[PDB]
Amino acid sequence: IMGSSVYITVELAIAVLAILGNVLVCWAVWLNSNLQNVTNYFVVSLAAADIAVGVLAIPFAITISTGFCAACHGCLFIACFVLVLTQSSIFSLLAIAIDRYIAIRIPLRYNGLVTGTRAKGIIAICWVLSFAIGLTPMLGWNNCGQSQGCGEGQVACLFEDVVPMNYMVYFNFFACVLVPLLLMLGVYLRIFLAARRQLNIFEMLRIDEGLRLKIYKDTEGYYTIGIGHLLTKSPSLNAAKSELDKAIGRNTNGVITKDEAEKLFNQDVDAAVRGILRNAKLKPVYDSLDAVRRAALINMVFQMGETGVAGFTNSLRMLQQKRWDEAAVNLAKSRWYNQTPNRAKRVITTFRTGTWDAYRSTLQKEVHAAKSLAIIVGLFALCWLPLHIINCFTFFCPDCSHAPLWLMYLAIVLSHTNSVVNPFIYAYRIREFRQTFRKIIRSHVLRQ
């Protein structure tokens, strides 16, 4: 066996899987409506880039490993085309990170901000930039436009001979790869840290009622901000903003910080507690509860009012008798539960257990999917960094012994493997993909 016949076989095998695997990803999104969200718009674009790697980039890699004589610019295309595909991938991974960001920290305006129309727009633009960036050497930044054994008008097509290293290190690596990766690292880290935030009465209603940092109109058209904090019933945004500046103690222009929204909420809680203590029915029960169960009672007052909660004569009684399970069953038979089952179910769980479980679960499911996608970026980095780092060595230490050929082509094979791993990850960690794959393979591929 030859030392190259292996290189060629291995890379042809990689190409077949790259194509088959990523065709399957696109196939699923087309068939399944539950995979036709905006997030998978970028997954498909990413899958497209990986298919193109198996079809063109890899054959180009093999062709160029011969060092054959070719025209300058024609040689640059074969060598640089893969850079186009790589850049596109970067943009796709970055857009996924951001998408998951404003979907987990700012859920209230995700669908009004992230739309299919805009996604397609951003994708189209990113493909243009990818060509502009990947084919920059073709635009003039090269080493042939000014070489023997090939005759004039031609040069031996060796990567390091035609593609400037200062381009590969400064522009390609540092600016176009390194920066996005670190940016994607910061975004995911912030997503994760948010799911591990410390829970309390503020984070409790932030989930049940939502958080707004810009003045908005409530269900009945009243100016409101923060967590359900009504400013005024006057039909004037101007007047609403003036009320806000009075409460905050500064010129807000209709926008406050998270912290400031919390101070308003704290005040709202204090008032509710005072109202509860003036009520002869609620006081005995409130006083007998622990801190967490009190928050669940305050939660109900924020929704139904103090007179409303005081109507639960029997459920309240059980609560003071610490008959948590009985109270739960009874509260479940209410018209309140029938109206808002999700919110009520969480509040009731809080009465049952006396923990923040119901609210911690919401955050841990609202992030589990982002872990799957984050793994995608980690593997990309792992598959591409080695090659980038070797370039830096060659570049920064000119008179050192160059990396041996075996190591060089090993880093190249590795980077190509990155176009195979994604489909496997979707199968293992994402349920709706796995189920669609099984359906496709069994029905359309085996045909039964």
Ligand SMILES: Nc1nc(NCCc2ccc(O)cc2)nc2nc(-c3ccco3)nn12
């Ligand atoms: N440095 C480099 N070389 C090659 N092919 C040339 C391999 C080689 C290695 C040593 C030698 O003496 C002659 C040729 N492809 C390459 N692709 C990349 C690359 C892709 C993405 C980032 O860097 N870098 N890179």
Ligand SMILES: CCCCCCCCCCCCCCCCCC(=O)O
């Ligand atoms: C012929 C058109 C595409 C058919 C794809 C056939 C499957 C080929 C296997 C190579 C890709 C594997 C990707 C992940 C495997 C899916 C696992 C599974 O759901 O059982």
Ligand SMILES: CCCCCCCCCCCCCCCCCC(=O)O
């Ligand atoms: C010169 C001929 C060789 C072709 C090489 C490039 C081939 C790679 C193109 C792959 C593009 C995949 C398109 C996926 C789009 C599907 C979108 C959808 O299902 O909504």
Ligand SMILES: CCCCCCCCCCCCCCCCCC(=O)O
């Ligand atoms: C799985 C394979 C799918 C088919 C992909 C098409 C492959 C394209 C091959 C690229 C060839 C590089 C150009 C060769 C230059 C020829 C020079 C000459 O003929 O004088």
Ligand SMILES: CCCCCCCCCCCCCCCCCC(=O)O
């Ligand atoms: C999706 C379309 C991507 C664009 C690729 C189109 C397919 C091109 C097939 C092979 C291109 C050969 C490049 C020119 C040949 C370079 C070497 C030479 O000058 O002989």
Ligand SMILES: CCCCCCCCCCCCCCCCCC(=O)O
């Ligand atoms: C939105 C369409 C962009 C078309 C310009 C792309 C030019 C070259 C693209 C090569 C592969 C592109 C595949 C993009 C598929 C997009 C998937 C989607 O938008 O749902």
